[PDB]
Amino acid sequence: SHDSLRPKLSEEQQHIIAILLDAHHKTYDPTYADFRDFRPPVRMSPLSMLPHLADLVSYSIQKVIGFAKMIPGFRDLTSDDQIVLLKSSAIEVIMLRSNQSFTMDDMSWDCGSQDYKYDVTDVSKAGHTLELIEPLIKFQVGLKKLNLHEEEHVLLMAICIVSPDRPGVQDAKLVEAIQDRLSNTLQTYIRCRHPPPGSHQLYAKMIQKLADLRSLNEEHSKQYRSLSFQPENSMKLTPLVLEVFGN
């Protein structure tokens, strides 16, 4: 109450933001140049997009880990806690980071050529049902409409990762200490740098998106468990996806 109700950003809070922007810029490629290295998309054989999207998700996990390692304090947690945090958050951070390529026009992910322009049918062709697709699209539209500053977007991803309430977290207080520093930075940023309106209720709306991501995670996990139970599907995944999501 002090760091949270702070009128203007401290020097420390400014450094936190700068660090997270750098971390995002070194782990998010807006030219999507590496996508050409994945197994090719196959559209139009109902799980035909599973290999390509498994490669996309595996690549995305590597980038999320790269980002997480730069969050102030994250690398100072025990290795087991780092693992737990990343295993639990990876799909949610993927959902958050993907919003940068999401377009409300045709509710697709533009990455950024026609072959790597992904829609609801592509998700369907990875084995997912409307029980996931529908709330996933709702979330993407809801997030896009918040019109976050890049500063808020990177703070939200970091807050998502360093969540002390994940199952299996050992040193919850240490995790909470990092998350609080980040949450305070976000609150102070919105108060002093985000112009009215749209700063109105923005912080609570962002926290609500974190809760929404938990629900999306649960649904994705249930469907993933169903899909990956069949070893001929698991075979089509990548070693990192199996390791991080389980087998």
Binding site: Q62, I65, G66, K69, R75, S79, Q82, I83, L86, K87, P239, L240, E243, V244
Partner: peptide, 11 residues
Amino acid sequence: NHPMLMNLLKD
């Protein structure tokens, strides 16, 4: 048992 994750975390 998370050698690839652990590798990607190491520096």
